[PDB]
Design a protein around this ligand. Structure first.
Ligand SMILES: [Mg+2]
Ligand SMILES: [Mg+2]
Ligand SMILES: [Zn+2]
Ligand SMILES: [Zn+2]
Ligand SMILES: [Zn+2]
Ligand SMILES: [Zn+2]
Lengths: 162, 162
DNA sequence: TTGACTCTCTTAAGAGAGTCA
DNA sequence: TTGACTCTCTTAAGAGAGTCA
């Protein structure tokens, strides 16, 4: 098995490579009518992506390193968390984009949590709008708001009560 | 079926059958430390379910009627909305449980909205905790809260900024 | 050892359609 | 005509693994 030192070396090479990705400045809603700025380190749209990186789906990538003649591969956003527990409350841990920008690989924009916690950040009011996430959101979720409901609760007769 | 009259008759038969499902009282968080009471009309756990109803998955059912000698079939929660647009902003409209209770078929607990709007209600703080849904939630979402994040944003080196 | 492709799978909110009796 | 089963599919947040040079 890879030693602690070897895992740290993988994380360091990953950080070195991602740090050279194009850095894009994005202005974002924080909640409470306030605006903030996030700096995303974005993997390229097409090959080559960077040393160790390859695309396995339209917005999915993997990181690969060969150590002592054995090929090791990880989801491209999971590398910052290789020294962390990989499950919690019986649920698999997932890399969760605080910036809601899939191509971004900035580890300061990622956390490690259940898929339900991950998804739920899409609707969070944001760090200045009432976020209660213990690991705080960096911005208001892109899907926060009144929604676009086509039809609400209704009955034609009198068979039901709420 | 095709005619508005035929559709109204489908909705009326569905309401009459679901109106005879057992009524189960559920006490629910509203947000703001308050609690409310919902009355869910719950489809049975096993056959028979009711005239026109059949189970196609562990928590999936369909409603079926024969009109003009042809079988017409719908997802069991979609029937209240048969006269509504079936898409919005290019997204499919879905039956969305305001009570977060799949077996419930009370149309006063259903709305008709995109899958994103539907999903997002799982994390809503609720009608007494800050819900901003234009079609208001009936309860705080079951997944609202601080979450259980295992690891937050972090870097080993000095290549990244937020 | 490395790059650039290929494939299918998970989850939990939701769907459509066929086989028998 | 009605009932009780069977199967696979959609979405958008996420995954693992194979092939070839
Ligand atoms: Mg996410
Ligand atoms: Mg729902
Ligand atoms: Zn980012
Ligand atoms: Zn939040
Ligand atoms: Zn209900
Ligand atoms: Zn709400």
């Amino acid at each position: 098995a890879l030693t602690n030192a070897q895992i740290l070396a993988v994380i360091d090479s990953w950080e070195e490579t991602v740090g050279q990705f194009p850095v894009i400045t994005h202005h974002v809603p924080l909640g409470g009518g306030l605006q903030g700025t996030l700096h995303c380190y974005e993997i390229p749209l097409a090959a080559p992506y960077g040393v160790g990186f390859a695309k396995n789906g339209p917005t999915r990538w993997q990181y690969k390193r060969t150590i002592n003649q054995v090929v090791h591969r990880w989801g491209s956003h999971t590398v910052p968390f290789l020294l962390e527990p990989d499950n919690i409350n019986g649920k698999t841990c997932t890399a969760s984009h605080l910036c809601h920008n899939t191509r971004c690989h900035n580890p300061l924009h990622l956390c490690w949590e259940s898929l339900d916690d991950n998804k739920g950040r899409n609707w969070c009011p944001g760090p200045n709008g009432g976020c209660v996430h213990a690991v705080v959101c960096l911005r208001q979720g892109p899907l926060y708001g009144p929604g676009a409901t086509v039809a609400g609760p209704q009955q034609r007769g009198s068979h039901f009560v709420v």
